[PDB]
């Protein structure tokens, strides 16, 4: 019925609803359904640009925007 | 006065041509306007609710709706105005759709807006001067009249009588039955046409609620939906029924249909039932199955020899000095079922109808093929009495013809009856071949296509070409039919022993006179016109008159019977209620302004006006039942002593003044 309940309630977002040509969820637009509180956050005043969190992540969902230093590449700064 | 203006968008049909916001603001600034407002569909239930809420909240005196045509939605908004505590007639429309939007769509928008403002202003000006009317209710006489005793007239009469209404059945001819009584077998079921009618003829003749008046005409009709004072001419039949004989004092009886009179009559004349092929005496019946078996005397051809009365003897049924008696009958509704006749095909000279012996038309063929006809049911050639072996059928004879001689329409049943006649010849004469020269076989009804398939299977030849001309062989009297086989692509010359023309049909003789007596108009085609061509094919614009049968347009016996029962139902609607409401548009004379000149009296087609005594002064008197609201008298009267109820001079002049207001 193209409600989009499956898209809201899939833990790893592998289902999307596109009404005309855009990802559009009317049931959320009208607030007719709750969503999952994954509650993610990374206190940037405590993270140290370590590489462990990207390494241990089973799916691909961590972005480490750090200049790439001499390790594996030309210096990000030096 | 307090007027509300409600402007419909009609779902962008109006908002796509003008500025509804501007029209609404102008209505607000207009004088007398309490509330102005808009909605997408004012004819819908939220629209009526909007009107009613506005009435209740703003204490509205009148309502103006700027919307579609009054002819489309007066009843809707009058009922919406009633529901809300107003009179229905405190309402007025401003047609801003069918006379503003749909005609000023393109490239002209502020001009259409100005036109809409003008129309709204004129409507408000009229509605600020409208006042309360109550429709007139008139009693309905509990009788009905059916003119025409064909299948459609008989069905309508039986339907009304079995609904319980007393009914008059007027037939100009001495017997009921119509054309279906002349038919031999009926398409597509091939039932004996006369036989199916006979029980229904017996039912009509025996029904206590039907006053069957054969051989009678309608001299004059006056009145309206309530009471129609119809004068009938009882033509001098010359022979007395048993009831009339007993009334006149002859105990022995009247006519029992023995036939001795016609056995001794020496005059011999053609029989119109047999299309002239057969003799009949001066005293006669059409056929042996006529419903009133009463033996009319033909006074135009009787020589008063008196042999018939001697043959009748003690029954004394024959009165050779009888004269046309006149009777006046009051009826509530009337049903018109006048039928049809065959178009005169001798005008099409290329098909030698009157000039070649062996060219006949389809009703003469139907009488020749019937077993009760002039022949013993044996089709023989008129020229020499020999049996034909090739028969041609000229379809479309005088039809779908724009030359001014024939009819520009299709006669509906001529393709089907030609198929029936081809089947009849191929089954009655062994080895005979039927050729149909056709131009669009039209087998559209139920089982008609299957009938067409079956005829082709039995072996009729279908040549798609309109016949060009017909030549008669000088010696054998055979007919050379010349046309082109359009599918084959070659000219043809088919020599047949008998040629049958499937002639067009036209309204019966005198039908225009009768429909003018009853006030019915005519169609483009020349048939009687119906109230609404789609949703009301039975009723006419004149109230209390209904149409049934071929008189409204050519049709087969099934469609004719459906139409006849529909007309009977429509005629029963007001009789069962017993009341009917007239539209309060009547003329009302203001007596202390009338001067008694009497000049308006002759301006009424309906004779609703007369001079009468009121308070010593001679003033004019309106029969409010007879008035129809035209307004001729009130547009004449110089002193303004006639008031038209919903279109009064102050109202119309207020509309004019509002138009010129700037």
């Amino acid at each position: 019925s193209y409600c989009g309940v499956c898209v809201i309630m899939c833990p790893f977002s592998a289902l999307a609803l596109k009404v005309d040509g855009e990802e559009r969820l009317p049931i959320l637009e009208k607030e007719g359904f709750p969503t999952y509180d994954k509650g993610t956050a990374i206190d940037q005043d405590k993270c140290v640009r370590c590489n462990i969190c990207d390494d241990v992540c089973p799916r691909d969902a961590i972005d480490r925007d750090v200049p790439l230093f001499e390790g594996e590449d030309k210096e990000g700064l030096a | 006065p307090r007027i509300g203006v409600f402007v419909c968008h009609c779902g962008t049909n109006i908002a796509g041509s003008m500025s509804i916001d501007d029209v609404v603001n102008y209505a607000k600034t207009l004088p007398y306007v309490a509330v102005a407002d808009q909605y997408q569909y004012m004819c819908s239930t939220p629209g009526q609710k909007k009107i009613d809420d506005a009435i209740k909240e703003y204490n509205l005196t009148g309502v103006v709706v700027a919307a579609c045509s009054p002819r489309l939605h007066e009843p809707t908004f009058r009922t919406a105005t009633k529901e809300g505590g107003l009179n229905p007639f405190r309402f007025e429309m401003a047609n801003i759709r069918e006379q503003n939007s749909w005609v000023h769509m393109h490239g002209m928008w502020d001009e259409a807006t100005q036109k809409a403002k003008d129309q709204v202003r004129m409507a408000v000006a009229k509605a600020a001067k409208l006042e309360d009317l109550v429709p007139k209710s008139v009693p309905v006489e509990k009788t009905a009249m059916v003119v025409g005793g064909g299948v459609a007239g008989m069905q309508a009469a039986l339907d009304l009588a079995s609904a319980g209404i007393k009914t008059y059945l007027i037939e100009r001819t001495p017997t009921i039955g119509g054309r279906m009584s002349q038919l031999d077998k009926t398409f597509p079921t091939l039932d004996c046409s006369q036989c199916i009618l006979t029980p229904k003829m017996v039912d009509v003749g025996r029904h206590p609620n039907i006053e069957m008046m054969t051989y009678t005409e309608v001299e004059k009709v006056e009145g309206y939906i309530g009471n129609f004072d119809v004068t009938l001419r009882k033509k001098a039949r010359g022979v007395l029924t048993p009831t009339e004989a007993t009334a006149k004092g002859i105990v022995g009886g009247g006519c029992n249909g023995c036939g001795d009179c016609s056995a001794v009559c020496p005059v011999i004349k053609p029989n119109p039932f047999e299309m002239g092929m057969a003799p009949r005496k001066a005293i006669y019946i059409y056929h042996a199955q006529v419903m009133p078996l009463i033996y009319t005397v033909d006074f135009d051809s009787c020589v008063k020899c008196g042999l018939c009365v001697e043959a009748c003897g003690d029954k004394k049924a024959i009165d050779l000095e009888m004269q046309d008696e006149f009777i006046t009958v009051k009826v509530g509704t009337a049903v018109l079922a006048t039928g049809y006749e065959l178009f005169p095909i001798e005008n099409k000279r290329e098909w030698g109808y009157k000039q070649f012996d062996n060219v006949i038309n389809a009703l003469e063929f139907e009488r020749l093929i019937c077993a009760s006809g002039p022949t013993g049911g044996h089709l023989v050639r008129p020229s020499d009495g020999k049996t034909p072996m090739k028969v041609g059928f000229v379809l479309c004879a005088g039809s779908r013809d724009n030359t001014g001689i024939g009819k520009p329409y299709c006669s509906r049943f001529c393709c089907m009856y030609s198929l029936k006649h081809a089947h009849q010849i191929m089954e009655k004469i062994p080895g005979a071949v039927a050729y149909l020269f056709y131009m669009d076989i039209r087998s559209f009804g139920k089982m008609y296509e299957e009938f067409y398939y079956r005829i082709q299977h039995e072996g009729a030849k279908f040549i798609r070409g309109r016949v060009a001309n017909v030549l008669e062989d000088k010696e054998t009297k055979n007919l050379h039919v010349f046309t082109e086989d359009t599918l084959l692509g070659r000219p043809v010359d088919v020599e047949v022993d008998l040629l049958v023309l499937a002639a067009a049909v036209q309204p019966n003789e005198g039908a225009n006179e009768l429909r003018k007596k009853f006030g019915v108009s005519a169609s483009q085609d020349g048939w009687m016109l119906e109230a609404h061509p789609k949703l009301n094919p039975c009723g006419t614009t004149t109230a209390g008159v209904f149409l049934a049968g071929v008189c409204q347009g050519p049709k087969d016996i099934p469609d004719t019977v459906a139409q006849a029962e529909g007309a009977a139902s429509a005629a029963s609607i007001p009789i069962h209620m017993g009341e009917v409401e007239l539209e309060p548009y009547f003329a009302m004379c203001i007596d202390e302004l009338c001067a008694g000149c009497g000049m308006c009296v002759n301006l009424c087609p309906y004779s609703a006006l007369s001079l009468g005594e009121k308070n010593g002064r001679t003033v004019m008197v309106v029969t409010e039942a007879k008035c129809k609201g035209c307004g001729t008298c009130g547009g004449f009267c110089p002193g303004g002593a006639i008031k038209m109820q919903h279109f009064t001079t102050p109202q119309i002049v207020a509309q004019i003044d509002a138009f010129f207001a700037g």
Binding site: - | S69, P70, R71, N95, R97, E98, Q99, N100, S101, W102, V103, H104, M105, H106, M108, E111, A112, Q114, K115, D118, Q119, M122, G519, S521, Q524, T541, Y585, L603, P605, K628, G629, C630, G631, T632, G634, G635, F636, M644, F647, T649, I652, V653, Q655, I656, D657, F659, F660
Partner: protein, 137 residues
């Protein structure tokens, strides 16, 4: 600065039906004529026409049923006689009598209604503003 002011008085049973049919069929014409809608043209009094012309109608049109096709058997014969006499009065008071005409439009002639609209507009545009509006002062 000047737009013609043409007023039409059309019967309900043929001219209103014809105008409605033209609208339904989407026949375009200029928006210069405004209609009044009486039941028959027999209702049209002479004083209606004269009142229009003295208020300042640049033109007046009266449209009704064909002869023999009046809903009320003979109400447009009366209107025709009245309008012939109105044509005579306007000619003898010195107003241009072609500012007034009476057309017979049937219920099915939406095209003819459109053509009547166009021709009335053209004729009044040629004639120009009515003289009453300045003769009053």
């Amino acid at each position: 600065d000047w737009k013609p002011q043409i007023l039409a008085i059309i019967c309900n049973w043929c001219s209103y039906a014809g105008a409605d049919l033209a609208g339904g069929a989407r026949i375009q014409y200029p928006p210069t004529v405004r209609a009044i809608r009486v039941m028959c043209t027999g209702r049209v009094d002479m004083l209606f026409i004269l009142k229009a012309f003295v208020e300042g109608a640049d033109g007046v049109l009266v449209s009704g049923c064909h002869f023999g096709d009046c809903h009320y058997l003979e109400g447009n014969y009366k209107a025709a006689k009245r309008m012939f006499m109105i044509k005579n009065l306007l000619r003898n008071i010195g107003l241009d009598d072609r500012r007034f005409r009476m057309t017979f439009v049937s219920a099915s002639e939406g095209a003819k209604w459109g053509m009547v609209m166009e021709d009335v507009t053209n004729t009044i545009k040629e004639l120009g503003p009515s003289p009453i509006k300045e003769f009053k002062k």
